[PDB]
Design a protein around this ligand. Sequence first.
Ligand SMILES: C[As](C)(=O)[O-]
Ligand SMILES: C[As](C)(=O)[O-]
Ligand SMILES: C[As](C)(=O)[O-]
Ligand SMILES: C[As](C)(=O)[O-]
Ligand SMILES: C[As](C)(=O)[O-]
Ligand SMILES: C[As](C)(=O)[O-]
Ligand SMILES: [Cl-]
Ligand SMILES: [Cl-]
Ligand SMILES: [Cl-]
Ligand SMILES: [Cl-]
Ligand SMILES: [Cl-]
Ligand SMILES: [Cl-]
Ligand SMILES: [Cl-]
Ligand SMILES: [Cl-]
Ligand SMILES: [Cl-]
Ligand SMILES: [Cl-]
Ligand SMILES: [Cl-]
Ligand SMILES: [Cl-]
Ligand SMILES: [Cl-]
Ligand SMILES: [Cl-]
Ligand code: NA
Ligand code: NA
Ligand code: NA
Ligand code: NA
Ligand code: NA
Ligand code: NA
Ligand SMILES: [Zn+2]
Ligand SMILES: [Zn+2]
Ligand SMILES: [Zn+2]
Ligand SMILES: [Zn+2]
Ligand SMILES: [Zn+2]
Ligand SMILES: [Zn+2]
Lengths: 312, 312, 312, 312, 306, 306
Amino acid sequence: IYQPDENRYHTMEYRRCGRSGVKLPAISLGLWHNFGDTTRVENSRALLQRAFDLGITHFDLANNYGPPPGSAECNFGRILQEDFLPWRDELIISTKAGYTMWDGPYGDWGSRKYLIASLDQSLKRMGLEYVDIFYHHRPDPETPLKETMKALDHLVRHGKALYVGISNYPADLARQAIDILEDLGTPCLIHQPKYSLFERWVEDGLLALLQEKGVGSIAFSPLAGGQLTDRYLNITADKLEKVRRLNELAARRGQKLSQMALAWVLRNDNVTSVLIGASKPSQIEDAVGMLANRRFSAAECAEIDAILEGRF
Amino acid sequence: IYQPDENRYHTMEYRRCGRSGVKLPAISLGLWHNFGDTTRVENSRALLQRAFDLGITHFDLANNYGPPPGSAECNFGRILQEDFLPWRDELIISTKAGYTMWDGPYGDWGSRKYLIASLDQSLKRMGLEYVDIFYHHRPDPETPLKETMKALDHLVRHGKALYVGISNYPADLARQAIDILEDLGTPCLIHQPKYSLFERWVEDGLLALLQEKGVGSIAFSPLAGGQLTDRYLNITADKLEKVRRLNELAARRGQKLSQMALAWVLRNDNVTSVLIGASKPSQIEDAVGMLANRRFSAAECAEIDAILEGRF
Amino acid sequence: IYQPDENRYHTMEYRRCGRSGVKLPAISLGLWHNFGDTTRVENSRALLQRAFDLGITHFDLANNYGPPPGSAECNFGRILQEDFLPWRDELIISTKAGYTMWDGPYGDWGSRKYLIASLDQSLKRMGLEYVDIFYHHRPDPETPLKETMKALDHLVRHGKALYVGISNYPADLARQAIDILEDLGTPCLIHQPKYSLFERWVEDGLLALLQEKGVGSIAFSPLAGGQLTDRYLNITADKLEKVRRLNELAARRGQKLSQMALAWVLRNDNVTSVLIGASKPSQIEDAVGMLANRRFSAAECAEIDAILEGRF
Amino acid sequence: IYQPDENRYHTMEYRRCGRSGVKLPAISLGLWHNFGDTTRVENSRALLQRAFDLGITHFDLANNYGPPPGSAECNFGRILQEDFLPWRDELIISTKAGYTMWDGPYGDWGSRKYLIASLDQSLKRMGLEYVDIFYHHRPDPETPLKETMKALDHLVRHGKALYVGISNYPADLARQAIDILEDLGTPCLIHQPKYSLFERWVEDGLLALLQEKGVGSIAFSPLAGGQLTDRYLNITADKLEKVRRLNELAARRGQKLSQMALAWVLRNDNVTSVLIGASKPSQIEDAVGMLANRRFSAAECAEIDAILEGRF
Amino acid sequence: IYQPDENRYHTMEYRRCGRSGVKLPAISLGLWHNFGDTTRVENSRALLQRAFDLGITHFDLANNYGPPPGSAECNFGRILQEDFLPWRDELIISTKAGYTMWDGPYGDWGSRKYLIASLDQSLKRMGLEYVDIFYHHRPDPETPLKETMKALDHLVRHGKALYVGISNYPADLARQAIDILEDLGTPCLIHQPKYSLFERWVEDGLLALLQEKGVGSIAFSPLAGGQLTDRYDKLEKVRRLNELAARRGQKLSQMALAWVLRNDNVTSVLIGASKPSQIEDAVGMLANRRFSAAECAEIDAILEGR
Amino acid sequence: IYQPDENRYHTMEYRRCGRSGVKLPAISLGLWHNFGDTTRVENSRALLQRAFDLGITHFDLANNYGPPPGSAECNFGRILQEDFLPWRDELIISTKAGYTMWDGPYGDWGSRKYLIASLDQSLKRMGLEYVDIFYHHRPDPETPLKETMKALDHLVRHGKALYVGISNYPADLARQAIDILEDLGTPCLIHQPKYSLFERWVEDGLLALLQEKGVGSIAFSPLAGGQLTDRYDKLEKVRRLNELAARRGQKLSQMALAWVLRNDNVTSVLIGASKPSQIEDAVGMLANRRFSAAECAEIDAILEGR
Ligand SMILES: C[As](C)(=O)[O-]
Ligand SMILES: C[As](C)(=O)[O-]
Ligand SMILES: C[As](C)(=O)[O-]
Ligand SMILES: C[As](C)(=O)[O-]
Ligand SMILES: C[As](C)(=O)[O-]
Ligand SMILES: C[As](C)(=O)[O-]
Ligand SMILES: [Cl-]
Ligand SMILES: [Cl-]
Ligand SMILES: [Cl-]
Ligand SMILES: [Cl-]
Ligand SMILES: [Cl-]
Ligand SMILES: [Cl-]
Ligand SMILES: [Cl-]
Ligand SMILES: [Cl-]
Ligand SMILES: [Cl-]
Ligand SMILES: [Cl-]
Ligand SMILES: [Cl-]
Ligand SMILES: [Cl-]
Ligand SMILES: [Cl-]
Ligand SMILES: [Cl-]
Ligand code: NA
Ligand code: NA
Ligand code: NA
Ligand code: NA
Ligand code: NA
Ligand code: NA
Ligand SMILES: [Zn+2]
Ligand SMILES: [Zn+2]
Ligand SMILES: [Zn+2]
Ligand SMILES: [Zn+2]
Ligand SMILES: [Zn+2]
Ligand SMILES: [Zn+2]
């Protein structure tokens, strides 16, 4: 019988998601990889237990995570029932619809049919009465935004999601989505964009829009899929040189490169949380350990920018 | 155990229903005839299986289809449970209320009482939690349109229908119905009118209204009840001459007359789908085969119009 | 096993309730008396069966009908389950809250607490998922009208009543109630006032207001509690003289006095239905027999008015 | 088997809560103390039975009452099932969320997550389908007021609370909360502030705001936690002198000091009810006995004010 | 959230109940007193948690335990749901019917109506699908033993009790009851008699009968209602016994519990407790369970007043 | 969506289990290894689908199979719901209790409490209303055999198991168990013993007893834990046996499975597998099941070291 570490809320920093009542853990765990039927459930279980023990209260899923599609939700559902049920109200659990889940015209994209039918499937797979956050997973250019937004509003009003969010929406469209949801009376809680030292698109307008609108943000691929780790220490030659120079700065800060890379995403206090992936419990411990040194000075930021813009 | 043809989504074209997230199959199957207790369930089952195998994802019912009334919904309900349940989220299932279903003042027309009580009966007969589209089946001149429209809005808000539509509404009234639904916040998805080479009323204003308003359309009786088929090849004498001349043009196009007649309804890309009836699986294969030649040139359209306006 | 008379919809006239989709039987049956534990269920059963056999599709209850309070709903609930369940969708069943039902501050009047808790009790006693019409039974001068009206709106939105109405509301207050309900989006279907040859208050403004607003009406005590019957043939002396003179006019019309008295309430086509009480099946047959002569000429109306204004 | 005293509605005065349909007992019983696992259930049961027998129809709980947290709701739940279920519709039961209930970021404060998850827990512990009043227990300065207010509106619309209220809100913020709720369409029923002879903050603006807005009020700690009782008769020396002088005035009125202190809170007819705590049935009898002399003259009010402002 | 001590099975002794598959802890906890609505649930909860943490896997209830009647079952039911549900299959939970529970002729004694209706009420109060052991709580001298025994047989066959027992049955009647249940196909698992240094009647035939028949035994009031403790003519015996306990390095209560289990003749002792320390004291008896012939002779001498 | 091979019943042999109505596939699949949380569900799913596609209709589980204990039942439960539910009435699913499953005196061995509580847990993990066969997994030398057998009888009468069996029971004890179950009215369907070319103890009396009593048999570890495969003094025997298999046109594993079923004396062989090819190899043994007296004499010679 699993018993959550009694010190878990001392080990983690919780950050308010935009202008809302929700505080997310600075580090959240994504189930994008390592929770399907091609990996071992013993390991999946160990990752979730380690995460909650360290104070990670947010687990992010999607209908099609696995492989195969739906298996991450099923495995999470089993582990939730077996180990976490007494603490479900201490967790923020998300899922999504918007990429390809099942074959045919109703198993992908942004229709009301797909969003409603898919959340019903997700709730069944996970064994939940509701999710905390339901996302539209990517934009659908060919479906009216109001249909998709009204499906999100309907799912909140009917108690299948407490809050809703959007993912992979460029700034212009995000603005439209946010304003529609506000008008419907179910405000967008959060935006999930890709953001790391190596992918800074959100700094071109998205982050400022979200701050304007009171919407939170949770960065995915914050380690640039593993590039911002020890992987290439012990990609292009220019990339490798950048990774070595960033790693030296991380060492100077008493951090692994991955730790500095996670800390850096929260450096301006305009991103709420970082969503990590993990295949082994030590990667979760390392991520949470980033909190020992979150601060970046102006000098450190300039040093990093010069490394990133460096050609030699 | 029925297993849907793995190539089904390669065999069919899916068309967006107005401005919405719903794509209907170019060919939909109606259960108006051949699904009641006066025909054989073995045949009914074969028709539904053949249809889905060819990519037809939309099955259109109504409360009073049979005979007797309600039997098409019951037979569909049984076949759905036995053969299609794992694929229910790949299907668009519709039903309707508005013609005579049961005796007395609450079993016909457009009252809130009849629409709500009838959809509850339909959901029970079909064994469904909700239908994808619920229609008001014909106008009710003596009930305020707002009562009927609010009943549709209520059924969507309370999760018994994902979308709503109207059938047999002339253009002026359709405009009023659409605008009311828009104001209530549950937009009309679709209009179901009668339309074929021999019944072109919708070209007098309805089709343009629906395009203006972003509402889709699904044509019923597209073969003019069997007249636009091989039936009279191997009605009036003038009709017969038209059928022979249209059949010659269809042969020139590598098509049966029925195939050309279905293709013709979608020729201007201002109708979403054609709703066919069938008594045998070969009629479903023939209908889907129309997709091999959907295109009509200006010259072909003029040739057809001249045949239709011909007196000798 | 009871089987409803196959000719029932030939025997009755159905009248549209204001501007709505609901047609009520010209004669409705009230369960105000003869359905409690102080009378015999065999008789109660016979009355309901006779009524439906003659085409009476509307049965009107209230929480406190009996005696004791709640017993009419229980007896109706049993008879409905035993005899009428297959035909529930052919019936309009109403109940009400607003007079004294249980002791204490929450068992009377017009609070949201009382209306919601009382309809839940009524639905349990009757064994129903919803009533067709739920009424506020009388005004509550000390509770804000908007609280009571919002409770009615909430019960419709949440599917416990298909429609709502008000009873015993004077015209000024009825106007306020109607306008509030319209603004909330759940329009008042019907008003239930006392109206007979001997109680004509509604002709002082109420009937014109209801016609203005598209609201129907159902008259209770249309026989002035039994005075407009054979009771005093085979009260004051002036009353008795009026009853004899009205009875002579009824005989001239081929009617019993009670038949003419019911017909008279519908004479101007500004009242929807008359709500009768009955202790024996013959009184229901007599009431429905009034339909053989509903018409009143200007001359007959003047003759009646002169009798009513007569002092000698 | 407990049977409620047949004279209970003769023994108590019921007072309208602001402009609403709800009349609260002049004396309500709070379960803040003496209903957890550190006291005896026999005593808890005796207190609730005595209270209802005397006409106290309102029992006020909160998620974290005990100790331990949740135990008062559980003990109340058991006693309700065992003894009070036939009379649940004669009771007003409240609960709250807003102080610390469970560990972590979702178990305290004012988020939609916490309010919804906590009311679901409360309904389970108490064995109820809904509470009569659900409160936000204290302000949350860091969560947008609209999120918290919309959670209250959502819980009413979805039938988990009949009415909502706020507690411990200063006047400025109370005004904002009230106006938001009005705009959402679920008006604030009641405000629960601390108020007694020794804590008169509400007279600085709150009571006038509530009267302006039609919102009721229920005073907690009306005996200043036991100071306004016999406790110090048979704190500071200045306090003690005040208690002796107030006690002499109470004796002159034929009252215990606690009785006068409760009566005084309702003296201006601008507070709805007083919420008492009790550890033994005699304290409930004493409280209800205050009703024998509720009236205060201008002279008595000046005498009390002079005692309160007295330094010697 | 309570978590059972991981070492709970490392020290406690488990003893097979007659010839059966059931091993009871040498010390079992009874809920006869201190589990009703007149004592604080915080304490009741602490007693159950301390007991299971020390390896006590058997909790003994009855319909009328409280006070008021039924409250011990309700309080236990709540604590079970809240704290113990994941470990229910590690517990042996008993209840009983046979004393006064409700008013009137069907709420006491030995009829099939009372036993069946009572176990249904107990299962509801405790929130259980079945009890591990259901007992007839005392003999009824006027209802045929076959009716009562058939009610026990019916309850096991219908899955409301895994096993049945009898309590307070004198030896001759116990023999009859045991033989009837064996014939019906639901053998008697266990007998619950009063037994202690001061109440040795079971040594006059009951214990030998149970051995003969393969039926287990669980002694109630093993400390003679608290007389065999630090709490105090019998006072002279208590003093003398306490001096022998002292020489054995034990509390008198510890020696008194050890004495009941001196032979494999008794399966378990059912203690009462109002405080966790009393449970800790009882489990500590395990450290010195042996008695020499000299010690037994000395005990008898003290008991017979020599 | 998985669709069972339409030819699945065209090649597999089915063998009647003693004197009963049950015919087991000649090759059955056990879930002892490679179905827990330490191996990938994708592979487990592929093994079950390949097995049923080849006509293997019997899947054998136990409460503690995994690791961890219970996970094989959970994973099987999930795959059953997802892929096999329409064909559940074409499957024989077994489970067992009798080894260590949970901590404490009620989570192992032979008591009625453990067997009943354990089958309830297994039915929940697997999402089944009943198993086809429930086994006592090993003998318990201290719980009366009647108690254990009556728990089996009770579970069948109450519809949680269609049939019962015993596993790992030596012949003399199996005789007693079989006779007790016959008397109770729920006859023993099947015995599951270890048997292979290297473990022939069942030929010393067990097989004859089962024939006499009409009870079937399903051999476990038929490849002696993988020794009778391509994986390798016994190594000299493995080499010599493999040369005989080669002359027969078979893999050693194939000849080893065929040998266990050489006589109608054994109903089925329960194989383990980590890859689908191992299942395919086992089913291929059906192509050469016969042994001449010369071949048997040659095998014995090899076995006895001549
Ligand atoms: C991190 As993604 C590919 O699920 O938006
Ligand atoms: C095709 As029709 C008569 O159901 O509108
Ligand atoms: C006819 As009445 C007294 O129920 O309004
Ligand atoms: C009386 As309070 C501390 O629950 O607001
Ligand atoms: C210990 As007793 C009096 O309940 O048998
Ligand atoms: C194959 As076995 C050790 O589970 O009997
Ligand atoms: Cl909605
Ligand atoms: Cl990453
Ligand atoms: Cl609605
Ligand atoms: Cl057609
Ligand atoms: Cl509402
Ligand atoms: Cl009348
Ligand atoms: Cl809402
Ligand atoms: Cl106080
Ligand atoms: Cl029986
Ligand atoms: Cl004792
Ligand atoms: Cl005693
Ligand atoms: Cl049985
Ligand atoms: Cl093997
Ligand atoms: Cl082995
Ligand atoms: Na994403
Ligand atoms: Na139509
Ligand atoms: Na009325
Ligand atoms: Na408060
Ligand atoms: Na006893
Ligand atoms: Na085995
Ligand atoms: Zn909700
Ligand atoms: Zn919905
Ligand atoms: Zn509804
Ligand atoms: Zn409600
Ligand atoms: Zn059972
Ligand atoms: Zn059965």
